[model samples]
Target chain A: LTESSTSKFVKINEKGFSDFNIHYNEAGNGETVIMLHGGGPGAGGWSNYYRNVGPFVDAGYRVILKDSPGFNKSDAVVMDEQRGLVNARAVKGLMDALDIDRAHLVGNSMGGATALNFALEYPDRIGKLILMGPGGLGPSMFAPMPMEGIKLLFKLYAEPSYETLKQMLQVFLYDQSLITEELLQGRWEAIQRQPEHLKNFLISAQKAPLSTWDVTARLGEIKAKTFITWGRDDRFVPLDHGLKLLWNIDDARLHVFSKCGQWAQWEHADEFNRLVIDFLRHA
Target chain B: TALTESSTSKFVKINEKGFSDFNIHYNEAGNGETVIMLHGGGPGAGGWSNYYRNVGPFVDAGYRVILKDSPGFNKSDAVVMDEQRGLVNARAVKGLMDALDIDRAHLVGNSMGGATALNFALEYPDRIGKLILMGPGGLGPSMFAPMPMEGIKLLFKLYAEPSYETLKQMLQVFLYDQSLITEELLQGRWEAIQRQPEHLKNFLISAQKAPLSTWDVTARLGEIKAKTFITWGRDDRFVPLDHGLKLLWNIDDARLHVFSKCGQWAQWEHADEFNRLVIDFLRHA
Candidate 1:
């Protein structure tokens, strides 16, 4: 894990229009697997999926974890109304820059929607999809907003405090005990590192109706094999959206974690990683 | 603006093998993009009064409207249907359109009619322009998990033991606002039930044989090509909001609108707003 800690950068067309730099981390060898992190004020590739990256690489698979443009160290680009389309294009640009024709795409929350959109737009470039607590499946029955987690993320930014950060972190997990002082301090520092980028990301996310980022109606067009995982007690996107994805996509299967919240990659990292490797490696 | 001068009601005869061997009663008015409306399943449920208040708004919006009574309900002749009730209803609707010489039209269905509309759209994708479903059946995983009995079981229980009191309670269950369960409406349903013993027999047999889950199009919903509008009431007991969201997820071109504190009769309770949503969506592109 220490040897694979080197960070890397690549120049690609941001949103397929302008030149921009994307920061990513790569490790190990064999079949390529691209991982995408969720949307949050302090969210990035390593921070969101660090627990699962090592297990995949140790299983003899090459892994690439990308920081979505405007989220972390990636270059900030102005997004138009079609936010998911832009994000999908950015991911594709990263893949194209690496000269990798195809790889397994895995995403969490908003990243899941981006992965789905990328599959929809570039089916030939994807081998399989692993979505964890994905957004844009359908309108959530619990919350009217598409990504309730993303909304809570903005709330943390609007009123930055140790107390508010703790509250927001609790909202992400079913087990409240996971909220530690060190965790809060790390996120608090990340938020402080790039306030301007965080503000611009929020503006781009809110530019159009959240439905524009939704791929529910178009789930049928995807040809990649899909594996959908969800927390039975997810506070953000809710479990019904996962059920909806299972009900829609052809050749798709699901595995739900009990007593788990939105962050399956972190809280249930071992089970989550095992599921991904088994699905991707099978046949 | 008077009710007499508004829409005209009539009956058309089609190949009755699929629907019924009798004239299908329907009302048609307005003159733009044709919109066909289907009513829910019940002994007394019909085309006229179910959408009497709903018709005028769409008519006034410069659009053509047609409300049809399904084969075994209301003024239409009774037909013995089993598990394929939705498919039979779909064929009946298509037959009606063919008889009327109409090529393409938008479909609006409520409850059982909503399920029928989906079936119709699936079979006749080329003929439909758009679809609007309100508290529709055919997609619900409620049975998979143990929960409170709310949807069709409630309806079945009430229908099994019919009385003025039971009728009132059942009607109230279909609504969020219990106050809307008026004596007049209860009495109307009761009287209609008494007048049609044969239709009641048909409905009971169909209900017993065809559970709502059996008619589920969840697996095949991707085949529907028309732009769909799914409207669900938050307090809908018969068809929960989950069914509506599932439709929005599975269909190719779809959107959802949920009314707070509303129930199965969202089109009736929020008539003006519901009509506005329908007209605006249909008119736009």
Candidate 2:
């Protein structure tokens, strides 16, 4: 039982736009698995991509984790539009910087939408796609405010009791105990960054409601052989949305993780990465 | 409010048992068959507080709605501490119906009310028409573990100095989403719990001590002659969703709806929608 880590940046250096920051750690050189992380309010490439990178690389695949512009080590965000759309562009930018014409895409949460939409718009650039708890399955991808678990998010570090941590953690998974203090502290620090940074990110997430994609109804058009996974207990994006996506996507099948919540990648990370590796290797 | 037509024929508390210190409240609406609603056991738990939003919708759809204040709750008698006290609330509600000269009604219960309603259906099968349970307790072997001790202690301490925050904290403990605890609602509960701490403790203790491990109605659920509709919150913080599923599969002609992001307040939170679904189930049955 051991873990190792490293990170490198892929600079787009686009003229007049902004330099795109790609902080990634590589392990192996098997099949390339590009992970698109869910863009939560305080989310970025490290949190979105960090957990999956080590395992995928170790599993004999080249994994690239990126910081979406305006988030984390990325250069100041320039285009300032819908958060989800921005994420899609960032993936394209990372691919160009790495000089990889195409790669297998595995996105979690909001990243799920980014991966899917990116695949639809650039079908030739994506190998078989794997979306875990992807957005746009329905309006459920983002929980509305008032009950957005916002209060719990703010109270995380203020003499946080186990129940407070548990209640907040429950917003992430069905089994509350799966939440560790370490993860809570890490997310706590991120959530405490400049209010402006947090505000714009939330605005971006709120702007891209799943209903935005309902009208487009383009999930059926993506030509990738996709495998989707969701926690049966996902409160953020209900599992039904994923079920709806499965029905629409031509060759998609969904696997549900029991006693799991929104963070299927971290809660059930080992099996999640394993499935990705297997699909990338065979497909 | 009751003078208004919709409000008039809406909420009713017929004195069925007439235990002097106690009164039973009920709502009668739907047509074809009868459906009753039970509530969870909390210091502030009452049929009106929990099911008022749902009863009118059921009434509008022409289904009979019967809401009752369990023993020692609301206007109900200070339920005597006895061996049969666990099922006493159900009996008193049934007695209320007897006094009103109604033959039978469907029993719908949530949480502890779910357990009592099921017990009523089991004990008086002929008197029941159907059973619709939402986030019910009483499945054998404790489907879910208890909440953290810190939460439990906090609730007990709140009983000493009940306030809006105290009541709010208690409600939040029962739900996955704390926003369900509104100011008006918490104020009402804080007053009620403060007024009747002893009765509240009795009800809580008895219900908690009930033999969850041996409470297997699983084998007997098939014997429950009534058709059932079971719904559990996908985010149920009290009872386990899987256990609720087991209850659904075990009963004959049972249907299940797992609501998204709802806690124990399933009917109230999704009141309008749940009312329609329940009325249709009872009316068609």
Candidate 3:
């Protein structure tokens, strides 16, 4: 039990499958909101939205932050045909474990994919959704070679070094000055500590091409009031993915921030927090 | 003569394809990053009133604004209608810009003016920096479907009858909130018609003469390279929201902002909000 950060663990079973403890943090009071972090080496709930949790909590709502399975402190789940489905079930199980009936979901990148899959699978469980720079809409509209940020991400994982990791982090932000030494060292330590998690993540990336995870065809079926946010200068996933999400989803609208990159919540933390809180607070 | 709020109409002569010694009536003010504003098509619709409420905020945001009346519309010299009104109007705008020594500019257009901007983008992609289209026309075959009968009838009736009642009815239809159609606006429309007998005849001819087949640019929308901002009024009676959707679908780097409870005159009704949205999109992106 990591009591320092209000962290807790819950045993989630996939019925006729194995069960393991999922690491999560729940705080504040009122209606529940689960915040899921992105997929990458060293990505965690705190790392993705630590800047945002305080604002959401202050707005009189219960906030749940979960590090998805095989990403952070959660027990490793094997990659299979139902990889996304399994992750979603784990989220649902986490809600059931907490005795929470319904909750809003806020997700970024791969976590956004997880939230989307969860909403689709268990529509009754979702109150609202906020997806920022999400994946699984489709592959990068541009050819693979043009995506330098993604290439740098793979290179960082392949050869973990202080310099390369710093470069990788810089690519995620429009303002490279935000890549502080402490941020670098912290992510480096997390990366070095979880070699096994990194390997599992790369394996999952290989197994699940964006085409396979694409829920574009089924986006029309989503009943949740979704707010899509994208950084205008996002080269990692590109703005086309967000536009596709806006076009496909029924009750979806988009907010694009100029001069910002893939990490919109981190780069534009205050704006992102206020927007999220205001959105969730209302209908 | 100083450039006052409503009385500052200047003329620039340009040597374009259709007209020799073309005198374009325009309103030029402010400084830095030129934004050319285009008004909708009608007998009385001029550059000033179409964008009077919209100009100040953009100016305060540190932008040079150029509000021009297209030929055969206002005080500008009249021209014979071409098969493609978009092409002719775009060429005239380019000529005016060239005459004014503006190398590049941001274009904002409404209704017929939107189609004109799109045509300008298609023709002179290098000259345009950004595009803002609000309740615009020209989205191919399905664009004119069902048509706005009330508006079309009112426009023609105003041309034939030319009464305050008919003009007032027409103005009210273009707005979601009828309260915005002040007596001043009604009087202005009435006076503009009464002063320019040739203007109404020119406008009617331009409306009835354009060949729809040649004017359609639906398939060629992908050719536009300029970053486009498409704004639509949800309750617009003139151009529907579907047109905005089609523009969003076709334009590669286009972003959409749909104003709820707004009509075709969204720039007037929601001036402050509209100005902010445009300025942010232009300055940031």
Candidate 4:
């Protein structure tokens, strides 16, 4: 029994926003679910939520895996506003171009921030939202600023390499055993595939010198039914932010997994898929 | 292997000040540090049904485990909760321990039982050891969600009109996964609630009809010196998660364990993990 070392994915690159191309992979048949990956080198919807896509698809959902403008196969683009808002606008453009009125969003890290921003910008176009350690809300109530994971991420941006990504993964996940040679190789390839992507991320970081991403004040206005998943030991976006979001969103509930780091979807993917699917249909 | 194999079984008479005397049923097993498990307030919820998955492992760990059925629930005699807010339940726990010749007990309580556990810890600090509360009540109303939470709303709804349909609604809110709510369990719970019509009426009395001031012991939480472990389901509709956070924040030596994709019943939903966690906590200095 040998697994093929090839692309099982049927990818798409479309002129979504007129200025640049949006690279995405759509799968399954049913309700629309657009997943947004976090912000980092080698972080794309396809790479990040690889484990998540199948379960959602199996549960009868049309899953959309997107590579944000500055990551993966998507065209690298710089941003003045925080990546959350920029990415959210790009998602809105994607939805518009695809001729879809409304769909669910499953965003991890920066993508979670993107989902929140999208809900804030276009409330009507939003369906259910599943946010996993999402950022861009604001400074945490209890966590130290520029959290440990973010510090490592900053380093990876300043100096891009497979070794740097390896260091980032240690803090990214609670279970280090999940880190593998193949995963490292694939992620490293994804990172090196877009050489300009790192520079664009640096440009985005330099472009916004402050907190344009701080939409903490307006989170209460979000109308979509939201499910917030968090890692109890999340190094990047602390558990406090998830709590804050739970308090702000009227119809929201947060699930904080014990002994988990930033990536709840990866660590607890099976349970995550079940919970999210339940939230969409029943909650 | 089962509660039927318990060394100690059946009811003990209990009396306390500011409340009427009543008999509280309990199932006791094993020997070592005593652990009295208290069940919730939902329809048909009893000590055994709530903790069937938990008792075996806990007993295996060499701790004497006692499953206490609150007054008016299961085999215990009936008392209107509306008249007394969990204080009677606490007094009964005191009565049970006294009857069994036990002093300090590490209380593991969920929801209504959680309230009873806290109340006992507060009223008689010398009588209790470590406290493990899961989605407990009696910590004042929610700060975020509406006054009566979604589970509470359904609680009154089910109280006012007890039916399979109403109970299904409440159970949905009680848990995150619908598949876990099996026909067998649902039917059993439905039949169980029907078995005690007096308990149902008492529940209604607890809900309304001059249900004198409900549990709001947030002001008095700091008094207890026992190390507390608070476990809550993030999607607990019956009791909001903030209550768990607040419990941790207020109690000096308290830590919390939150289960994602879980509802009010952390003990049941994540039984193995929760059992291991509680055992670990009980062992910690």
User: Highest DockQ: which candidate?
Assistant: 3
lDDT tens digits, residue span A1-283, model 3: 1225677788876653356788888779989989887665677787777778888888888988887887667787557543556578888888888888999998887778888898898999999998988776666665363377777777876887878887877778878887766556657777887678877766776776555777778888889988788776776776667757766677665666655778888888876776677667653
iRMS per model, in Å, is 17.3, 8.8, 6.2, 8.0
Please tell me which model should have the higher DockQ, number 1 or number 2.
2
Instruction: Give the worst 10-residue stretch by lDDT in candidate 4 chain B.
Output: B206-215
Candidate 4 segments exceeding 4 Å error: A1-16, B1-68, B71-109, B115-133, B137-285
Candidate 1 residues B123-164, lDDT tens each? 999889999988777665753334334656656665566566
Which one is best on lDDT?
4
**How do the residues B126-155 of candidate 3 rate in per-residue lDDT, one tens digit apiece?**
899999998776565444457544555566
Native contacts recovered by model 1: 0.00
Model 3 residue runs over 4 Å out of place are A1-283, B1-3, B143-145, B148-153
Candidate 3, CAPRI quality class derived from DockQ: incorrect
Where's the lowest-lDDT run of ten residues in candidate 1 chain B? B142-151
- Comparison by lDDT, 1 against 2, better one: 1
Task: Give the least accurate 10-residue stretch of model 2 chain A, judged by summed lDDT.
Answer: A141-150
User: Which whole-number lDDT from 0 to 100 does residue A254 have in model 1?
Assistant: 58
DockQ of each: 0.02, 0.04, 0.07, 0.05
TM-score, cand. 2 vs. native = 0.70
Pitting candidate 1 against candidate 2, the one with the higher TM-score is 2
lDDT tens digits, residue span A1-283, model 1: 6414648889887445567788888998878999988876777787787788889998998898888878777877657656566777888899889888888988898889888988898899999999988776657765666355667777876766767777778889878887766556657776788777766876776675456777888887888888887775677787777767765776575555644778888877876776678778762
